[PDB]
């Protein structure tokens, strides 16, 4: 039993409080999806009404995406600037007791704002929203029960975060790990109940399962094992990911600055630029579907081997551009799921080349797709084990655990020894830097 491995006392009331967080964050995530689904579906509704007139069809594809995104960007800047971006480094800073948790503002704004952006088909994941909404719900039940002390504050906050990520990806184990590998700080120690995190996670996960009729987010089928002879090829894949991750990080950070210059703070300009980017991804959604959107659409396609090498390269470059654009603009939305799609494409690409260059081996291109899927998470987020267990939980391919660990180990060691840093930490340090420039 895993239950025996964690017989460490935490107050019971707090545990009960965690199940409340879990259930609420569960419902939150679920309702969020249905909002996103509904909007993407209303958007298609217009595109069918105008299948007659082509230029108008594009112009509506642009405007509906623009008007939705503009709504998002506005809420954030009018009512809750910290709801911009992922909001994972906010929750990280809150766990450092260095950032507030203004749930009364962040709750409606992150929810409807992401509903805007993700409803528009912007290249943004639901992770940022569900973790930040989650953590903030944690703080919310804490404040309602007027609960006391660091242990309650940190535990319920991390429960909200863990359950949030669990619910995004029907992946309970990822949720737990993600707290202990990335979200908590070290050398500035904290008090987090494993049992509570487990409990919240378990409760949000079943929420997903109840409202999502027995379906995988990613159906990749079953794929072949990885021969021993092959194992070294996964280390080369990883080394590539270890060089690219830190470069992407700089690109992510640099693009936050570069885009800031366009509006220089101004709400109207910011919303307008946001609307441009908003609208653009809705256009791209119709004309080149794999360059825009979330990324779950193309992952099963690319894994089966249904794209071509030339097409893979097109998608990679195009998605790097639209991810850096949608996210660094500071819309409510995550970079996490975008990193899964980019990793899968890069991984699949590596497959195709490996298959031909080594015809003696017995290679499936799709097994390099899966090992890459979590390898940008190892190289940029610098949370390898989460990526791995996440990918393992979402794809169900448990036979690939060793090639995947080799890819991740390679990614992180190369990411460290080229002087990159955790993307969420770098974003937070930048936030704390601005806050410590007015003191
Ligand atoms: Cl994110």
Curated annotation (Swiss-Prot):
Sequence motif: Selectivity filter part_1, positions: 85-89
Query: In which residues does the motif Selectivity filter part_3 occur?
Result: 334-338
Name the consequence of residue 86 to A. Uncouples chloride transport from proton transport
Q: What is the effect of changing residue 182 to C/I/L/V?
A: Abolishes proton and chloride transport
Q: Which stretches of this protein does UniProt put in the Periplasmic compartment? A: 49-55, 212-231, 289-308, 356-365
The UniProt record lists the keyword Transmembrane: yes
Alphabetical UniProt keywords: Antiport, Cell inner membrane, Cell membrane, Chloride, Ion transport, Membrane, Stress response, Transmembrane, Transmembrane helix, Transport
Effect on the protein upon substituting residue 182 to A/G/Q/S/T:
Abolishes proton transport, and reduces chloride transport
Topological category with respect to the lipid bilayer: Multi-pass membrane protein
Could you say what the effect of mutating residue 127 to A/Q is? Abolishes proton transport, but permits the transit of chloride ions. Abolishes gating, permitting continuous rapid transit of chloride ions
Q: Briefly describe its induction.
A: By acid-shock conditions.
Please write the reaction equations for the catalytic activity of this protein: 2 chloride(in) + H(+)(out) = 2 chloride(out) + H(+)(in)
One record GO biological process: cellular stress response to acidic pH
Extract the GO molecular function terms from the UniProt entry: chloride:proton antiporter activity; identical protein binding; voltage-gated chloride channel activity
| Keyword Ion transport set for record | yes
Q: Which residues lie on this side of the membrane: Cytoplasmic?
A: 96-102, 146-155, 181-193, 261-266, 418-439
Show which residues form the site (Mediates proton transfer from the protein to the inner aqueous phase). 182
Q: Which GO terms describe its cellular component?
A: plasma membrane
- What family name appears in the similarity comment? Belongs to the chloride channel (TC 2.A.49) family. ClcA subfamily.
Checking NCBIfam families in the record gives: PRK05277.1
Described function: Proton-coupled chloride transporter. Functions as antiport system and exchanges two chloride ions for 1 proton. Probably acts as an electrical shunt for an outwardly-directed proton pump that is linked to amino acid decarboxylation, as part of the extreme acid resistance (XAR) response.
Q: Cite the record's note on assembly.
A: Homodimer.
Q: List the protein's name.
A: H(+)/Cl(-) exchange transporter ClcA
